[PDB]
Design a protein around this nucleic acid. Structure first.
Ligand SMILES: [Mg+2]
Ligand SMILES: [Mg+2]
Ligand SMILES: [Mg+2]
Ligand SMILES: [Mg+2]
Ligand SMILES: [Mg+2]
Ligand SMILES: [Mg+2]
Ligand SMILES: [Mg+2]
Ligand SMILES: [Mg+2]
Ligand SMILES: [Mg+2]
Ligand SMILES: [Mg+2]
Ligand SMILES: [Mg+2]
Lengths: 96, 249, 143, 87, 242, 72, 145, 99, 136
RNA sequence: GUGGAUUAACGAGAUUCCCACUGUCCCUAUCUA
RNA sequence: GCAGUCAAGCGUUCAUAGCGACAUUGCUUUUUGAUUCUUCGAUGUCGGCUCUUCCUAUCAUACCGAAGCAGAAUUCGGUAAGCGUUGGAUUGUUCACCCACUAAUAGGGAACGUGAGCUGGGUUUAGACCGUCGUGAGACAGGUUAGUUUUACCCUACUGAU
């Protein structure tokens, strides 16, 4: 027999298995697609999470109810000292 | 509603109505029953089929019987104009046929549910369900001609203009050559075309204007030919009923 | 909190404030308006027998008499004595709107103070005159 | 219509607010016996009458509040028992 | 007399403030409301596109005439600085410390006389007399206590809510020294003060205001040249038919 | 719009420019289209389509026989 | 009976197995997550000496709160200040990636203007932004004289 | 049944002032209002109508208006400045006064 | 659907489930309002519909005038007593739950509102703003 | 066909409402052995 | 269903032995929309809580076709199961029926999913009372009360961990 009272499912099935990670450093699985006429740029950085705080910003957003008003927002601070370049790796496109 | 009747939903012929209600029953009820089930399951299966078909027909009839206006419960002018446009006895008789067929469908539903209460087999219950649905089908097939008449009168009555009988009103009148229609074209904005032949306007039209910050209506007239009392058509009946009923200038 | 102060000081169980009662005890017309109340079905003594300091309604008049004799009433009367601590005191304690608070203090020690004390004296003798030979049972007749 | 107000003269079925039956009886009474069986002290509006009856029957609440529903049910039970003239 | 809308509502008095020498418009969305005011007015008086206390209801919170402007205590000092920067020095802006914080609901003023709520403090009444420079009178409006929302007033005449009595009209017009009539606005609304702004040469209403209502308010506010405010005796047939 | 207005708009303005050729091409495609519906429709709609086709064929042959018998 | 922090029915007669989608117990947290579209509110330098100040604040202070970040310490380097929440706890390593597509929202096109940055203590209920403000509010103490 | 039944009497009749004093109080129109050419929406002569700037600088919910662009100050480099608003733990508006 | 409300409403903490008593804050003749439904609420199994400040509900009158009782009417919530957040940052609450009687087009039945009114409700409803003398 | 019909007090007897009160619930969280 | 007129195939080339598809009329009126306070309901071994999947016979959302489809709002169809489908009230219970809110409150299967996952009632007795029958012991699936089943540490499956 049918359920007689519909309800949505508890939880997301695309975030399975709920297991421990393989490292502390989570790995980047996609990079922005290359455009061979732009200048040479780095596409990511790496730093350390150091706490939260609170700010006040003066908001400019045309069409909203908070246009030209003051808004309290939470922010996160990441400590980013410089990074230092030590090597280079080349990758070839194989039919695997 | 009161002044305009572009709110009657739709009506269907008898064959299309039968197709709609019976295919709705077959689609929205379960269709799989087995001989090995319990007899209460079998009786509830066929009882649900009978009740659902009856309630579908009753709902389709009850939409019409409240959509169409009551001829004897409206203004005298609107009653006389509707009486001239379509015959009053044909109107009343067709809606009475709809009401009688509705009550007979409820009777068939109740009697065959009571007969399904004591069925002893899938074969017996199936024959009873088929007999009930066939009797309902015979009723709806006997309803053929009032449905076609009511379809025509709904399609005509939807387009009809909106005259308030209790407002500021200028009535125009005269002989069948244009005059009045050209004058209404001058004083208002409308679509009443001016043409040198006599019965260019076979109905009556409304225009609106504003004088001293009030809203005025202006009703155009087809034309009364020459005739005393009973030689006139419904076209001249429209005009003389408008003059007889509209307290106007 | 725990359970006691949650049961007592909940927002739907809030009681009237001292500075509102101080403004009630000033202005003799407001004292007459608070003594001559209309009939009310949701008040204990049908809106009558009301204490202005302890802003509560009594059942009978003998209940008001024993309440006026008691020790809770004397605590509230001692609380309603001096300058009644509005936001001006907090501002001037922070060092802000200090001249306005000083005008307020000298005004309350010049004018509003002795008026409040004279109204409180007249009210005390009026209540002591009225609540003297009262019976303990009450006529339920609300007229 | 008021089928429940018609049936309320007969024995009570599941009443939640008797303050429709109370003015019904107050229209459907002569004053000569109600003021004797209840000793009404003055104004005979339904609210004041129900108030003095709550304070007379002792139908008070926490604080000293007249409960109106209980005492109007007491009047309706008096009508069930038959201590008011009726015909 | 024109007809506009704020977004799709006819309450012009809720979202605008109009006097003889400046205009105040609520911000939000587009430039259609400001441009309607600017199309009718031009560069003749300043139009200031402002907010009060973060809200858009700026006609019912402020109160001003030709001489001054009054903002409630709920306004901020940045908004008050913006107003002082936009308006010239001939109009003075005062912030009031008053319990009744809807000043446009509790007073109804022109350049000479102001009606007020009866429960307004003496310091507030002295401040109204000092800043706006007017004669203050405590008065109801046929029993209603919100005189700014239930009356609309200028230097020529006045329009009150339609269930006002004739002796109330007589006493109030003697106090106000202007001809006073009762009527509706926005197709039959009793709140005539919060659906229509007006000064000596302009009135703005909502799109649903009918043509009899428009003709009556043009007459009583003496706006067009053919409006001597006694034309209701020649316009009475419209009213008796209405 | 008052009393019947679509045909007055037709007489006053016209129909579409591509109106007639579309109707001719629709009637030309209907012959291919009625055979595609006899072969693609399954279930109950196929049985209903076959019943309507049988009724139409009997009606047409009855009309032909009655016309030739009545005229000759 | 047998507790209430549970799923009551974990399966039926058919299929005669527990299915892969029927919510059992186990490890929570320590998962790798990617979150997108976080706006950068300030890129601060490690030698600015007023990088916690704005054009509406006029006070010489850095972004380090009063007493340090709880379980972290001072900043003393360059920093990124982004809007909202970020996966992981404090003092963990984060990878910041550029946008993988061109965003066509106005939120990605606005220009943020900070008015104030909070630097009170998060170890407790802080109510002073600078130690000079705390000393000026409290006044002179017994050890100060 | 009533006097032109009652919902006409306080509306068709105008209340008269009946003067009580000797204060003259006249309507005021600033003369720049009398010196307007009337806006006509189907002409090339038109003034500007800020709706136009909003149209050619984006949409309705896209154009961002500068409210400091119509301030009346003593200098015109001052129109795009900002107030300091806070210094240490104090508000600048609490201390801002002449003298 | 959302009739009478000018613009949009942002998210505010809901305080009043279905089955709550609130005060009546206008002079129409009622004393309290019993909340039986909330206009424009979602559907979820086991979840009660809940109203917050600035919402239109369907209510009945339990105490008050004898004419107003035994009928269902629209009302608008004007005071909440459950603490919500302003976007200029502070949390705040009132002393009681209170609302006023309205028609489905948003217009008000009474003539004046006693006590303060939340500025979010006054910004969302123009006829509430025209009938109130104290806005927070 | 004229044990039957009521009954104050009493009851770990059976059924239905009201006031008060609340984690029964919305909708869960945290702490101790 | 009964009765009558037909008339393509028919009785494997016969029309009227004897069938007979598609049609067509009759018969079932408180027969001029009238009455009908009615739920004329069904249901006795299941009902509720919790939770997960599948079908399409599609209620809503996406895209199309037709309609006297002016606009707006609907009606009837085609593809389509990606996604949703509620809060209460009430009779022993459930369906049905009511009150709202809603974009919508579609229909089904999985031992009428989930009677040793948990619970009210049954299976399931022994005490007692009323009604009816029996001379009596007793009986009644007539009515009302009170009433004992109580793993997991094993293998697999599943969730996490070496
Ligand atoms: Mg289902
Ligand atoms: Mg990849
Ligand atoms: Mg902390
Ligand atoms: Mg005996
Ligand atoms: Mg399909
Ligand atoms: Mg799916
Ligand atoms: Mg819902
Ligand atoms: Mg079970
Ligand atoms: Mg089990
Ligand atoms: Mg037994
Ligand atoms: Mg027992």
């Amino acid at each position: 027999s049918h359920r007689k009272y519909e309800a949505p499912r508890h939880g997301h099935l695309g975030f399975l298995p709920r297991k421990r990670a393989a490292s502390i450093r989570a790995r980047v699985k996609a990079f922005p697609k290359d455009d061979r006429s732009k200048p040479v740029a780095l596409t990511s950085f790496l730093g350390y999470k150091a706490g939260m705080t609170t700010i006040v910003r003066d908001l400019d957003r045309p069409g909203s109810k908070f246009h030209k008003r003051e808004v309290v927002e939470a922010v996160t601070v990441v400590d980013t000292p410089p990074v230092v370049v030590v090597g280079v790796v080349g990758y070839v496109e194989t039919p695997r | 509603m009161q002044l305009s009747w572009k709110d009657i939903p739709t009506v269907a012929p008898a064959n299309d109505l039968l197709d709609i209600v019976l295919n709705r029953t077959q689609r929205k009820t379960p269709t799989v029953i087995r001989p090995g089930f319990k007899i209460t399951r079998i009786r509830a299966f066929y009882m649900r089929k009978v009740k659902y078909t009856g309630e579908g027909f009753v709902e389709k009839f009850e939409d019409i019987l409240k959509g169409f206006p009551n001829i004897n419960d409206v203004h005298p002018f609107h009653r006389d104009l509707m009486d001239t446009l379509y015959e009053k006895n044909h109107y009343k008789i067709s809606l009475a046929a709809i009401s009688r067929a509705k009550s007979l469908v409820e009777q068939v539903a109740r009697d065959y549910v009571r007969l399904l209460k004591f069925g002893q087999s899938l074969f017996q219950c199936k024959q009873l369900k088929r007999a009930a649905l066939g009797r309902m089908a015979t009723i709806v097939k006997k309803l053929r001609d009032p449905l076609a008449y009511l379809e025509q009168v709904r399609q005509h009555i939807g387009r009809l203009p909106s005259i308030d009988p209790n407002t500021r009103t200028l009535l125009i009148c005269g002989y069948p050559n244009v005059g009045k229609s050209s004058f209404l074209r001058c004083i208002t904005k409308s679509d009443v075309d001016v043409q040198p032949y006599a019965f260019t306007t076979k109905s009556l039209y409304v225009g609106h204007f504003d004088y001293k910050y009030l809203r005025f209506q202006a009703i155009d007239t087809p034309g009364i030919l020459d005739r005393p009392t009973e030689e006139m058509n419904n076209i001249e009946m429209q005009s003389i009923y408008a003059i007889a009923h509209l307290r106007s200038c | 909190m725990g359970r006691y102060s949650v049961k007592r000081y909940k927002t739907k169980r809030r009681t009237r404030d001292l500075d509102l009662i101080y403004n009630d005890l000033s202005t003799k017309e407001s004292v007459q308006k608070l003594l001559n109340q209309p009939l009310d079905e949701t008040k204990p003594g049908l809106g009558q027998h009301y204490c202005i300091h302890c802003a509560k309604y009594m059942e009978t008049a003998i209940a008001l008499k024993t309440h006026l004799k008691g020790k809770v009433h004397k605590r509230r009367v001692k609380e309603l004595r001096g300058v009644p601590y509005t936001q001006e005191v907090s501002d001037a304690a922070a060092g802000y709107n200090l001249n306005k608070f000083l005008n307020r203090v000298q005004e309350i020690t010049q004018s509003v103070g002795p008026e409040k004390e004279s109204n409180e004296a007249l009210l005390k003798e009026h209540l002591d005159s009225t609540l003297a030979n009262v019976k303990t049972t009450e006529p339920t007749l609300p007229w | 219509e008021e089928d429940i107000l018609f049936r309320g003269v007969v024995r009570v079925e599941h009443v939640t607010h008797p303050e429709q039956y109370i003015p019904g009886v107050l229209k459907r009474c002569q004053v000569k016996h109600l003021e004797r069986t209840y000793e009404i002290s003055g104004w005979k509006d339904a609210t004041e009458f129900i108030e003095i009856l709550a304070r007379k029957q002792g139908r008070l609440l926490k604080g000293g509040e007249p409960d109106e529903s209980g005492v109007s049910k007491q009047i309706l039970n008096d009508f069930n028992r038959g201590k008011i003239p009726w015909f | 007399a024109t007809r506009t809308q704020f977004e799709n509502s006819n309450e012009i008095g809720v979202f605008s403030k109009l006097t003889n020498t400046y205009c105040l418009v609520a911000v939000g969305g587009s430039e259609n409301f400001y441009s309607a005011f600017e199309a009718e007015l031009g560069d003749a008086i300043p139009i200031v596109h402002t907010t009060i206390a973060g809200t858009r209801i700026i006609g019912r919170m402020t109160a001003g005439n030709r001489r001054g402007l009054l903002v409630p205590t709920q306004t901020t000092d940045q908004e008050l600085q913006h107003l002082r920067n936009s308006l010239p020095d001939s109009v003075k802006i005062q912030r009031v410390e008053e319990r009744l914080s809807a000043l446009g609901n509790v007073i109804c003023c022109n350049d000479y006389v102001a009606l007020v709520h009866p429960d307004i403090d003496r310091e507030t009444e002295e401040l109204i007399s000092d800043v706006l420079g007017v004669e203050v009178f405590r008065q109801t409006i046929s029993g209603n206590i919100l005189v700014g929302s239930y009356c609309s007033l200028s230097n020529q005449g006045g329009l009150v809510h339609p269930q006002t009595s004739v002796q109330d009209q007589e006493e109030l017009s003697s106090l106000l020294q202007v001809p006073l009539v009762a009527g509706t606005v926005n197709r039959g609304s009793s709140v005539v003060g919060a659906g229509m702004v007006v000064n000596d040469y302009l009135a703005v209403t909502g799109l649903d205001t009918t043509a009899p209502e428009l003709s009556v308010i043009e007459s009583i506010f003496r706006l067009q040249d053919a409006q001597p405010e006694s034309i209701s005796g020649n316009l009475r047939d419209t009213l008796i038919e209405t | 719009p008052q009393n019947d207005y679509i045909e007055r708009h037709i007489k006053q303005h016209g129909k579409r420019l591509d109106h007639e050729e579309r109707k001719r091409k629709r009637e030309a495609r209907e012959s291919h289209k009625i055979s595609e519906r006899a072969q693609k429709l399954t279930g109950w709609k196929g049985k209903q389509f076959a019943k309507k086709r049988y009724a139409e064929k009997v009606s047409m042959r009855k009309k032909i026989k009655a016309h030739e018998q009545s005229k000759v | 009976h047998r507790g209430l922090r549970k799923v009551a029915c974990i399966g039926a007669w058919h299929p005669a197995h527990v299915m892969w989608s029927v919510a059992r117990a186990g490890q929570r947290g320590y998962h790798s997550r990617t979150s997108i579209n976080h706006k950068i509110y300030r890129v601060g330098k490690g030698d600015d000496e007023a990088n916690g100040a704005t054009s509406f604040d006029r006070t010489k202070k850095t972004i380090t709160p009063m007493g340090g970040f709880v379980h972290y310490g001072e900043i003393k380097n360059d920093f990124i200040m982004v809007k909202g929440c970020i996966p992981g706890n404090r003092k963990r390593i984060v990878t910041l990636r550029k946008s993988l597509y061109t965003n066509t929202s106005r939120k990605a096109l606005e220009e943020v203007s900070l008015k104030w940055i909070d630097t009170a203590s998060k170890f407790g209920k802080g109510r002073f932004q600078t130690p000079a403000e705390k000393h000026a509010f409290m006044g002179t103490l017994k050890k100060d004289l | 049944s009533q006097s032109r039944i009652n919902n006409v009497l306080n509306k068709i009749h105008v209340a008269q002032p009946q003067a009580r004093d000797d204060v003259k109080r006249t309507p005021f129109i600033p003369e720049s209002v009398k010196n307007l050419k009337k806006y006509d929406p189907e002409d090339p002569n038109r003034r500007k109508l800020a709706r136009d700037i909003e149209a050619e600088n984006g949409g309705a919910g896209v154009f961002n208006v500068n409210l400091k662009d119509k301030y009346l100050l003593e200098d015109d480099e001052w129109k795009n400045d900002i107030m300091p608003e806070i210094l240490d733990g104090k508000n600048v508006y609490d201390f801002l006064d002449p003298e | 659907s959302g009739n009478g409300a000018q613009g949009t409403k942002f998210r505010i903490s809901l305080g009043l489930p279905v089955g709550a008593i609130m005060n009546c804050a206008d002079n129409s003749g009622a004393r309290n309002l019993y909340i039986i439904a909330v206009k424009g609420s979602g559907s979820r199994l086991n979840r009660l519909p809940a109203a917050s400040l600035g919402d239109m509900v369907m209510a009945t009158v339990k105490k008050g005038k004898p004419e107003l009782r035994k009928k269902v009417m629209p009302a608008i919530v004007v005071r909440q007593a459950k603490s919500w957040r302003r976007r200029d940052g502070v949390f705040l609450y009132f002393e009681d739950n209170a609302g006023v009687i309205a028609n489905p087009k948003g217009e008000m039945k009474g003539s004046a509102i006693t006590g303060p009114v939340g500025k979010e409700c006054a910004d969302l409803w123009p006829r509430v703003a025209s009938n109130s003398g104290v806005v927070v």
